[PDB]
Each structure stands twice: as structure tokens, then as C-alpha cells.
Enzyme design. Structure first.
Site, PDB file in Angstrom:
ATOM      1  N   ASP A   1       0.050  -7.810   1.673  1.00  0.00           N
ATOM      2  CA  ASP A   1       0.265  -6.368   1.559  1.00  0.00           C
ATOM      3  C   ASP A   1       1.742  -6.011   1.710  1.00  0.00           C
ATOM      4  O   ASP A   1       2.119  -5.088   2.435  1.00  0.00           O
ATOM      5  CB  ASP A   1      -0.596  -5.613   2.575  1.00  0.00           C
ATOM      6  CG  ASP A   1      -0.653  -4.122   2.304  1.00  0.00           C
ATOM      7  OD1 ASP A   1      -0.198  -3.693   1.224  1.00  0.00           O
ATOM      8  OD2 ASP A   1      -1.158  -3.378   3.171  1.00  0.00           O
TER       9      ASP A   1
ATOM     10  N   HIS B   1       0.800  -1.221   0.000  1.00  0.00           N
ATOM     11  CA  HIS B   1       0.000   0.000   0.000  1.00  0.00           C
ATOM     12  C   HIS B   1       0.836   1.275   0.000  1.00  0.00           C
ATOM     13  O   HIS B   1       0.323   2.328  -0.395  1.00  0.00           O
ATOM     14  CB  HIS B   1      -0.964   0.000   1.188  1.00  0.00           C
ATOM     15  CG  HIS B   1      -0.289   0.038   2.523  1.00  0.00           C
ATOM     16  ND1 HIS B   1      -0.149  -1.080   3.316  1.00  0.00           N
ATOM     17  CD2 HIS B   1       0.274   1.059   3.211  1.00  0.00           C
ATOM     18  CE1 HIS B   1       0.475  -0.751   4.432  1.00  0.00           C
ATOM     19  NE2 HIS B   1       0.744   0.542   4.392  1.00  0.00           N
TER      20      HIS B   1
ATOM     21  N   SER C   1       3.855   4.032   7.598  1.00  0.00           N
ATOM     22  CA  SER C   1       3.762   2.587   7.460  1.00  0.00           C
ATOM     23  C   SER C   1       5.120   1.993   7.106  1.00  0.00           C
ATOM     24  O   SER C   1       5.948   2.624   6.444  1.00  0.00           O
ATOM     25  CB  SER C   1       2.736   2.220   6.389  1.00  0.00           C
ATOM     26  OG  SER C   1       1.581   3.035   6.487  1.00  0.00           O
TER      27      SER C   1
END
EC number: 3.4.21.90
Lengths: 158, 158
Positions: A58, A36, A110
């Protein structure tokens, strides 16, 4: 103090149009970038790699150049119940859940590791779901042999 | 010197060939940049904007992203005759003209904001005419309503 130096060597920054969007920490021989996380890695050599994508976990990975393997952080499969370390403070791992005080994670950011008390990467953070005074974390983590992404209901990809 | 806070929040560099060409400034809701200033803003949030342009006013503007509006400078249309604050020295306004001690205006510096004795942005410098020791500045300015451009003859443009 100590684990932050390991993070400062492990972390590299993913830029989109020049704007920080996330990070791609070198773990073992893998450049662990979340899928992402938009944009491209800032390191001119990590941008040359070809990445094995995964929509399920992911996650993206590639073999880091042989130059980097001295800098890349140590992992462990060991996740005993107790106390863990992270850039935005300290983490508790209990009931199989990584959990953090409300709002300590922010959009972007992230791809931060979570470390044990020896500075070994134990997870890569993906987001979190608030539950009163604590949030659980969406996290890439792994067993002896495989990744086993944890992702509770109501999570957001911060 | 108190205006240097507002100036340092207002100014963003305009970059070309790896060097400064001039400067862009958050004036009210609009980013101001001279149209002769080639290159792109250093700030991605500004460089991604699309700008409305005039060759008559030698000016390019866009409404700044909503979060940047906290940093944007207070404009004013009022120009009493007297001293004005600026980065390279005290500007003076006299007889409808902006004027400076010769030398303070350097190649570039275009887009630097000139401030009144209340710290309000009143002009956007573009260049200067040689007037001996007391050069006079080519300037973009605004009334209550539309912009109006000042440009004395013999201006070297920078």
C-alpha cells in the site's frame, strides 16, 4: 517541539480537487506516499516523478530530485521497545505493535511518519484498529532490507 | 456589527483569472450565487456541486453539503422599512427599494448578503443604480414561497 520541525520539513500534502487527502513524506531518498491516498502531491516537482506502485505494501515511492535530499528526513531500521513520537502526540511501540490512544488518528491524515526519540522515521502510518482504550496502528515499517507492513484485524484506513 | 460573524461564515469567494469576481453565500439550505458572476467558488465542496440556474432571477443555487449546513445563515422574507446591516455600510429599505450611500457598492461584491436588525439574511446584492448620493441596489429577494428579483433601471451590473 523539535521533531515537529523535522516533520514540517519532511511532509508534503496530497490534494484531491484541492482538498487535503493525505501526505507524502520524503524519507531517505524516497517520497513515501501511501497508495490509498487519492489525488496528487502539491509540490510541483514531486508531481513530475514516476512512482513504483505496490498493492501489497500500500505504498508508492520515487527517487526525490537531488534538490530535496537535504530536506528529506533520516530513517532508521532500529525499532527498540519503548517510546516514539508522532504528530498527534506520542506513540508506544510494544509487543511489536505501534499503539495509540483511541481516536488520536482521524480519517485522512494518512502518511504521517512515526519518529524515534532522535527524530528518525521509523514507520509510515496507514490506519488503526481500536482495542478498548488503545488502538494499534496499521503501519508501513521496514527491517535492514525490506518493508514489512503491519496491519492488524479490524483496522480502518484513517 | 454582530452580523459580520454570520456574513463571514456565509460568504465564499468566487474566483476567476486568479482574482475575485464576486461572492457566494450559504442562505438556508441553498448556496446563492448570481448568474452573471463568472468563475468558480474557492471552496472545493461548493465548486464541485451542480447548480440550478435561472436567467430571469439571475441566480444559481444548489443544496449545500450536509456538513456545511452548520455554517449556513438564517433567511427571512420579512422586510420592514428601516435600516439593514451589510459589509460596505448600513443599507436602508424604503418604499420597497434597497438603497445605499453611493460608493459603498463597488465593482464585484455581488452575492454579499444584506441583514435585518436580527441578523437574518434578507437579500442578495447584485448591482446598483446611480441615484446621486443615494444609489439604489439591484437585488435578488424571496417571498415566503418563490424568489423575486428587484432591478431598478440604469443599474450598473457588478
Amino acid at each position: 517541539r523539535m521533531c515537529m520541525k523535522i516533520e514540517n520539513d519532511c511532509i508534503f500534502e496530497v490534494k484531491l480537487d484541492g482538498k487535503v487527502t493525505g501526505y507524502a513524506c520524503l524519507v531517505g531518498d524516497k517520497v513515501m506516499k501511501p497508495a490509498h491516498v487519492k489525488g496528487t502531491i502539491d509540490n510541483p516537482d514531486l508531481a513530475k516523478l514516476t512512482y513504483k506502485k505496490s498493492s501489497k505494501y500500500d505504498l508508492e515511492c520515487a527517487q526525490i530530485p537531488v534538490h530535496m535530499k537535504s530536506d528529506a528526513s533520516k530513517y532508521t531500521h532500529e525499532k527498540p521497545e519503548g517510546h516514539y513520537n508522532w504528530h498527534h502526540g506520542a506513540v508506544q511501540y510494544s509487543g511489536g505493535r505501534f499503539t495509540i490512544p483511541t481516536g488520536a488518528g482521524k480519517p485522512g491524515d494518512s502518511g504521517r511518519p512515526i519518529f524515534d526519540n532522535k527524530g528518525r522515521v521509523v514507520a509510515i502510518v496507514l490506519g488503526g484498529a481500536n482495542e478498548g482504550a488503545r488502538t494499534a496502528l496499521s503501519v508501513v515499517t521496514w527491517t535492514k532490507d525490506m518493508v514489512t507492513r503491519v496491519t492488524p484485524e479490524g483496522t480502518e484506513e484513517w
